[PDB]
Design a protein around this nucleic acid. Structure first.
Lengths: 40, 335, 557, 151, 541
DNA sequence: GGACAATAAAGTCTTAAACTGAACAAAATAGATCTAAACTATGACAATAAAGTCTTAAACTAG
DNA sequence: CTAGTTTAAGACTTTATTGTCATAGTTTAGATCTATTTTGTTCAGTTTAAGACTTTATTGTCC
């Protein structure tokens, strides 16, 4: 029953999840860039 | 009605970066190009391939080979844990949109008769691969043109591939389209997200995809060339190969991958795609680990220094001879 | 759930899924030779899977993925025609309904002039083999049963007789022929079957076939050579002793006609002649790594790739010795004919740094500046290396069959000829060729050894063979006119074997010299024997001079 | 170069050279009490000298060129008739030929009434000790074991 | 990785590699007596080697190349004749192709008149044994079965016929022979084969009484058995010499003290009869005699380099080549002391025969500058400003010139003399020594010199040894310090040293020098001493 | 102790009869090489026949 | 009806079996060559035991 509620909540708006995961993607890309710069 | 797996389309782009090896950080590979395959109904990405040369359809068939396989192994190999629901794309589509006149004849024959995939005319493109890349890089336009085999800066490839894979997964699973033309039958509670549309279509309209095995599909789509046979083995592009089945006709043929010169696939009898594997011999062993583009570049360099280098070496050796002769004669005269 | 075109076992019976639709699944059996596709509900399939009646499997018709029939073959055309005929039915949506299937079948029959049975067979093959056009390829590859067995013919009794005769005669035996075994079989068959005439026995062709089946077991490089020579004016000096004078040198060179590449050379300190150029020819057929290494020059095989005998020598037989011509023509298989007019290649080699005199070939006449030879040889060798390897010829004529990327450099032409025209040269051992081409003269034999030119030689073979006693005979010896230390005696007239002889004690005071100065010294000794009478008077005068000087000196005291 | 009556070592054995004529050399060993002189070629001796198989040494019988036995002594007489016995054979140009040598030995045996073995012994002793009359003096000086204790 | 003429094992079969060319390797089996060479690829050989079916070994014909049959033996001519037949085929570059090979074989058959099978056999032998001429030597060394016995088989008798008939040696006779040999011959010494044969005859008699005597095995058969299997293993140089002498009228003086006058010199010379060459000389100061000419004879047999070097003259061995004894010395036996003749004849083996009439070849040496008086040999009887040095130098140089360069006119050349041979003494000496004489004989100079000196009886006293009224003593006389007629040899030109002979019968000598109480005569000669004593005796009475 | 035998020990020599070893020639015997004619194994070509697959025509059949 | 099946006949497709050549390389009996082993006869040079000669140490008879 809880899983159905979680799925409904996720499918309700999904814009907040979109923005949060875009932020996470940008952060991890920047982290990889910094690690590459510091690698040599 | 249209649905997931009814039509596939190709796209490509070029990124303005230079790549290096992951272990040896001092070897420059070149500028990267990206190929992607898009499903028309859901606008979802199905496969990819990274090259380092001019975009062409002959090379774009490797993204189609990728598009029909299971992608768990490559995701795991790049330290990514993935489940089937995030990428459910295994099987063969119905129609592939490309240029029939820009592909080889054997490729079209294999696609049409042996695997039953219809090849039709491609529609105009959009900024799909460009949109994937230009988020954190610089892009210049890429144009497909003919295949030309023969003779005519701190980032590694691993990190580039990891970034590309994570971007693809993010766009597929979480991003929401805006200019999508919705259909009447769509439920109101269904957002324009590629995986949701994929699931709805698979549940309602198409059913499933078709069965296929990867080795035959990959071999059937490689490029081919005529080879020579002699006491030194099999001669292809100037290199020499041998195998166990050879140590046991006028027009034989072999398939090669333009990325690694290590192995080739010889077709012994005509009318069949049964092959033998051939590896490099010691007579060409000093080419191990290279690609065909690098080998062709080396051959071009070797055949280039034969016009003015002749006179340059002539003059240099002439004055060297004059100097040694004069110094020897002077030393003899002194004593 | 399931994919399209996948096979399952349902109670040990293979079935193929043709279409999956919402609430229905259509399948067909691929084991019999009749039937039509049939459908039912997914819940039943789930029930059978839960019970364990359905299991997964592979496709027996997967090999059809490897087929690519050639154009203008029967398989290709038959496949295309069959697919063209049955295309309109499988494209239709209501292809699994018997009624519409019927109207479509007779619609095809009307316009294609084919019976219903063939149309049904084609549809059955398409559905049962994997829903591809390669499923409509005829099975003509099965005709003839390849690899399988099929004026009297062969009978099982005759086969048993064949096996018996082979078993007791051919197997585990050596030195037995097939014809004698055939004769034995003929005897056996005659003594079992007397009625059949003679012209009706099985032949030896059949017997041998059964036994074999049942019991498996233009002008390129090296075509011709040429010889040239020149003279250098400078006087040379001995390297160890900077006071000795040798003389002005003469250079012989050997040239390949095709590539114009230089193969060998020789330096001699006398008048040019065709007898002495044979040493240049001997050098031209050897490996020059050692001679270059000895002169402080490091060389690789690639730099001078010229070892082996040629095919033709260009020289006139009139100026050569008969034994040399015979050895070239017969012993080593080298043809000799007329020499074309020569050009100044040797002078071109030497004119860069020295003044040259014109060289003319004369007859062989044996009998009665601080630069050293080492530096001269080094200079000539390096000049030859540069001229061969890097210098480009401008007046060289190019034939039609040459690539445009081939420069006029002798080594490139040599390699191109090796890889395209003439293969390689023949092999030879150096000592035999060197000895066989030296000049030779008649010798005498006595208890003091072998006498040649007034000198005496001895060896171990003449002692063991006890020859000095039973041979006191017209014998020949070969000599090198540059050193008197060793000679080569031919023990039999027109033979191939030679024995090496060294100087004895009576003549070891000539050691280290050459024959030219030995002949000089002999002429001087003859002149001294002539003028000894005049020398006697001078000796006398010196005698009285000393006597009177001593007497007067004594008288002084 | 060698002289007549010179001693050499060949494989550590002493040999005395007796004659030289036209490239042939006659020599005899001086170690054992049996044998006859042999001849071979001079160039073979040069070969032997080349690689050190033939060297020079000292003559073990030089002490005989110091002896002057008095008249009316047993050595004087014995030497005189022993020399007169073999004088015919040593004055022949075929003394080194086996068959003529046999005939000469027979002649001496008949004429002097002596045994063949004695003649061969005298020839061997003359050739071994330097080709002089003094080589035929007997060894009577060792008899009696002088300067010892009889015990 | 592969070398020409290398032998390898392939499935336990030996194969020899003949050639390598552009990916191909030609090989031939060397075990059977049929076949032709085959060709394969090098990649297949590498696969064979990696799998483990191909290994390396040694060539069973390495000894073949180190062989040398003598000329005139059938091996030599057979090899030479067979190598000349197949020469056009092995000199071809198409010799491994069947059709061209057939054409070449047909040409050889038509030319040399030989069958085709012979050509194929010769080619097979050449290829199988190492591609050398020694591969064409026949196998005649195997015929006749060398080293094996012929007694087991046959019935007849092998060998010559008796000049009636014997028997054949059978294995039982061999057993009897071995029994007798083991019983009576092995591990003993001094026993003869004849008595062993006598012992075997008795045993044969008792075993075989029927057989008569004339059919017994003979002693040659027994001896051959025992040996087989019980092994026990005219004129010329230095032929005649002559003596001549002369007197010069000039008076010579001492080199240091020019006041002293020595006298008139006498010259002795020794001549080679054959080539008329001067071999030695001696300078005296008294009337000529043979006893003093013995010193010239002594000097003639030695090496003259030292004496010439002492007089500031440099010569070599080629200028005066006369070392050793001649065969004959030609002088007067009567006018010699008996010990000299005895020593010459017995210890050195030089004959002395009578002298012929003399000549004047000494005058030619001496008369060129000085006046000469007549010289005559007679019996021994003992009891200006010009030094001797310059006179000796002049004599030596004149003799050298006469020997080396002067040409004789009256000499009669021999028949065998080459025309281009000058009539010069040294040339004749060298020619004769090269062709006729051989060499001279060996001698020790000190013994020869001491053996020919004059001798005198001495006396023993407390003062020492008394010779000619002079006193000598030495070290060795002190040990005993003692009269059985002792004797001493002396030199009549110097009184310093004498040679005593202690033991009679041998010429072993002791050296004695002048004592202090008689050395007022030191430095001068015996003639001066005799003159002084004579004048003292004349003026003291 | 001196001396003179004087008897014996140690080394050397000749004889007489017998023996020996190397060399030659003639038998008997064992292995190698060549000829002459015929023969054998192999590959290439052509023909013939067997074995399998295919469609047609016409009636049949399960429903 | 009616949608789907069966059978006999003739032609087509693929390949195994057999008849004749042509030729590079081999086999076979018989004759002759090359080398060996075994025995008869001769002759130049050697061995061996016995007794005699040669030389000198050790002792006897005498002063």
């Amino acid at each position: 029953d809880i899983q159905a509620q979680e799925k409904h909540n996720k499918a309700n708006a999904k814009q907040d999840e979109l923005t949060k995961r875009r932020e996470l993607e940008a952060f991890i890309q920047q982290t990889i860039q910094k690690a590459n710069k510091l690698t040599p | 009605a249209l649905g997931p797996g009814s039509r596939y389309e190709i796209d490509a782009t070029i990124a303005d970066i230079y790549l290096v090896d992951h272990h040896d950080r001092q070897k420059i590979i070149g500028r990267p190009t990206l190929y992607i395959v898009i499903d028309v109904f859901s606008r979802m990405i199905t496969g990819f391939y990274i090259g380092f040369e001019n975009p062409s359809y002959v090379v774009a068939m490797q993204a189609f080979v990728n598009a029909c396989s299971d992608k768990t192994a490559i995701c795991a190999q790049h330290d990514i844990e993935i489940s089937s629901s995030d990428w459910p794309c295994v099987g063969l589509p119905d129609v592939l949109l490309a240029d029939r006149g820009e592909l080889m004849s054997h490729q079209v024959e294999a696609l049409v008769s042996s695997f039953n995939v219809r090849v039709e005319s491609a529609p105009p493109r959009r900024g799909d691969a460009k949109g994937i890349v230009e988020s954190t890089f610089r892009t210049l336009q890429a144009e497909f043109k003919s295949f030309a085999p023969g003779i005519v800066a701190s980032l590694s490839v691993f990190e580039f591939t990891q970034i590309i894979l994570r971007t693809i997964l993010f766009r597929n699973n979480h991003l929401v389209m805006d200019k999508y033309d919705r259909d009447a039958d769509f439920p109101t509670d269904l957002p324009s997200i590629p995986v949701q549309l994929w699931q709805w279509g698979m549940q309602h309209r198409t059913g499933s995809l078709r069965a296929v095995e990867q080795e035959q599909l990959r071999v059937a789509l490689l490029p081919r060339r005529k080879v020579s046979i002699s006491s030194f083995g099999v001669n292809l592009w100037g290199l020499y190969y041998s195998g166990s089945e050879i140590l046991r006709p006028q027009h034989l043929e072999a398939a090669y991958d333009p990325v690694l010169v290590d192995t080739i696939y010889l077709f012994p009898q005509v009318g069949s795609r049964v092959f033998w594997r051939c590896n490099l011999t010691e007579r060409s062993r000093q080419f191990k680990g290279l690609s065909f583009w690098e080998v062709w570049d080396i051959q071009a360099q070797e055949k280039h220094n034969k016009a003015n280098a002749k006179q340059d070496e002539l003059t240099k050796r002439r004055e060297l001879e004059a100097f040694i002769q004069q110094t020897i004669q002077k030393a003899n005269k002194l004593t | 759930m399931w994919q399209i075109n996948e096979v399952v076992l349902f109670d040990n019976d293979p079935y193929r899924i043709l279409a999956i639709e919402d609430g229905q699944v259509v399948w067909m059996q691929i084991s019999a030779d009749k039937g039509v596709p049939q459908a039912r509900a997914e819940l039943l399939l789930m029930q059978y899977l839960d019970e364990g009646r359905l299991v997964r499997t592979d496709d027996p018709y997967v090999h059809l993925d490897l087929e690519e029939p050639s154009v203008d073959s029967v398989s290709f055309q038959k496949r295309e025609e069959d697919y063209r005929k049955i295309l309109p039915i499988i494209n239709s949506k209501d292809r699994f309904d018997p009624k519409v299937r019927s109207e479509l079948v007779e619609h095809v029959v009307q316009e294609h002039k084919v019976t219903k049975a063939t149309v049904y067979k084609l549809l059955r093959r398409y559905w049962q083999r994997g829903q591809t056009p390669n499923a409509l390829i005829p099975d003509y590859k099965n005709s003839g049963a390849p690899g399988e067995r099929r004026g009297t013919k062969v009978t099982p009794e005759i086969e048993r007789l064949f096996r018996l005769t082979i078993e007791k005669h051919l197997l585990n035996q050596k030195g037995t022929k097939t014809t004698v075994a055939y004769r034995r079989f003929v005897d056996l068959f005659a003594q079992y079957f007397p009625r059949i005439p003679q012209e009706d026995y099985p032949t030896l062709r059949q017997f041998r076939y059964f036994y074999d089946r049942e019991y498996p077991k233009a002008l390129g490089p090296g075509s011709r050579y040429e010889i040239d020579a020149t003279i250098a004016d400078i006087y040379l000096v001995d390297h160890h002793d900077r006071q000795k004078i040798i003389g002005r040198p003469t250079l012989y060179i050997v040239i390949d006609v095709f590539s114009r590449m230089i193969t060998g050379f020789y330096i001699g300190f006398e008048n040019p002649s065709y007898v002495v150029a044979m040493q240049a020819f001997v050098n031209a057929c050897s490996d020059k790594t050692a001679i270059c290494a000895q002169h402080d020059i490091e060389i690789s095989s690639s730099d001078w790739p010229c070892v082996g005998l040629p095919d033709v020598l260009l020289a006139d037989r009139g100026e050569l010795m008969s034994h040399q011509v015979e050895a070239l023509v017969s012993s080593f298989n080298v043809r000799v004919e007329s020499a074309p007019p020569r050009r100044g290649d040797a002078k071109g080699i030497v004119e860069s740094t020295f003044r040259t005199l014109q060289a003319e070939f004369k007859s062989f006449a044996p009998g009665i500046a601080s630069l050293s030879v080492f530096e001269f040889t080094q200079i000539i060798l390096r000049t030859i290396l540069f001229r061969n390897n890097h210098l480009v010829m401008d007046k060289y004529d190019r034939d039609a069959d040459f690539p445009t990327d081939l420069p006029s450099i002798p080594v490139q032409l040599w390699q191109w000829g090796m890889q395209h025209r003439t293969g390689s040269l023949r092999a030879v051992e150096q000592e035999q060729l060197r000895v066989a081409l030296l000049p030779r003269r008649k010798v005498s034999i006595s208890s003091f050894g072998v006498n040649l030119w007034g000198l005496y030689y001895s060896g171990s073979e003449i002692l063991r063979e006890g020859w000095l006693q039973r041979s006191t005979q017209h014998l020949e010896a070969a000599y090198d006119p540059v050193l008197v230390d060793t000679i080569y005696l031919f023990p039999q007239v027109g033979s191939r074997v030679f024995w090496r002889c060294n100087l004895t004690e009576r003549s070891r005071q000539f050691k280290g010299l050459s024959f030219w100065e030995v002949w000089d010294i002999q002429a001087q000794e003859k002149h001294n024997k002539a003028n000894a009478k005049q020398d006697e008077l001078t000796k006398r005068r010196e005698l009285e001079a000393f006597i009177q000087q001593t007497i007067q000196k004594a008288n002084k005291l | 170069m060698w002289q007549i009556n010179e001693v050499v070592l060949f494989d550590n054995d002493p040999y005395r050279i007796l004659a030289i004529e036209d490239g042939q050399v006659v020599w005899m060993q001086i170690s054992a009490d049996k044998g006859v002189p042999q001849a071979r070629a001079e160039l073979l001796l040069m070969q032997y000298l080349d690689e050190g198989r033939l060297v020079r040494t000292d003559d073990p019988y030089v002490h005989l060129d110091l002896e002057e036995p008095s008249v009316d002594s047993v050595s004087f007489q014995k030497r005189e008739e022993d020399y007169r016995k073999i004088l015919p054979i040593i004055n022949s140009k075929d003394r080194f030929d086996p068959k003529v040598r046999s005939e000469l030995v027979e002649h001496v045996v008949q004429e002097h009434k002596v045994t063949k073995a004695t003649v061969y012994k005298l020839l061997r002793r003359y050739w071994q000790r330097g080709q002089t009359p003094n080589a035929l003096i007997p060894d009577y000086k060792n008899s009696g074991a002088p300067g010892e204790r009889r015990s």
